[PDB]
Design a protein around this ligand. Structure first.
Ligand SMILES: *C/C=C(C)/C=C/C=C(C)/C=C/C1=C(C)CCCC1(C)C
Length: 137
């Protein structure tokens, strides 16, 4: 099954609460929530190799990984981490993150392709889960 495509966000829930856990002050949280409403995700999937480009109006980032192989990226609030993605089912994967330096909330993310053709991303910090839903452009 295939995540490849150009995805545009239709719903973003609990993102402010996630950023709050991660220590972001209120004005930056509000501006970040607004930036998230413009989020686009481009995915190229080849077997278990993924190329992902996530962008908003003024920023773009590339995430490249192979399932089961450690890689480096950043947490949501922007701290370098070591990440490891595993499948949880046919169309859902889970990424566990570990800070390269220092300490903080336990963070992770998941990506799921639903039977109805939506892409669901969750991002977690401790007890707080943000859910974002995308459809194909
Ligand atoms: C498989 C898809 C993944 C791993 C998507 C990750 C997306 C992010 C880490 C998005 C982060 C953003 C911020 C930290 C604030 C600016 C707006 C976002 C939503 C692009």
């Amino acid at each position: 099954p295939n995540f490849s495509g150009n995805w545009k966000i239709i719903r973003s829930e609990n993102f402010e609460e996630l950023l709050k856990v991660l220590g972001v002050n209120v004005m930056l949280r509000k501006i970040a929530v607004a930036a998230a409403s413009k989020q686009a995700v481009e995915i190229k999937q080849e077997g278990d190799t993924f190329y992902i480009k996530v962008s908003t109006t003024v920023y773009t980032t590339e995430i490249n990984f192979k399932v089961g192989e450690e890689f480096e990226e950043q947490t949501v609030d922007g701290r370098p981490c070591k990440s490891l993605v595993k499948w949880e089912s046919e169309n859902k994967m889970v990424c566990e993150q570990k800070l390269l330096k220092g300490e903080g909330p336990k963070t992770s993310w998941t990506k799921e392709l639903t039977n109805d053709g939506e892409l669901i991303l969750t991002m977690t910090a401790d007890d707080v889960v943000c859910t974002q839903v995308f459809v194909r452009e």
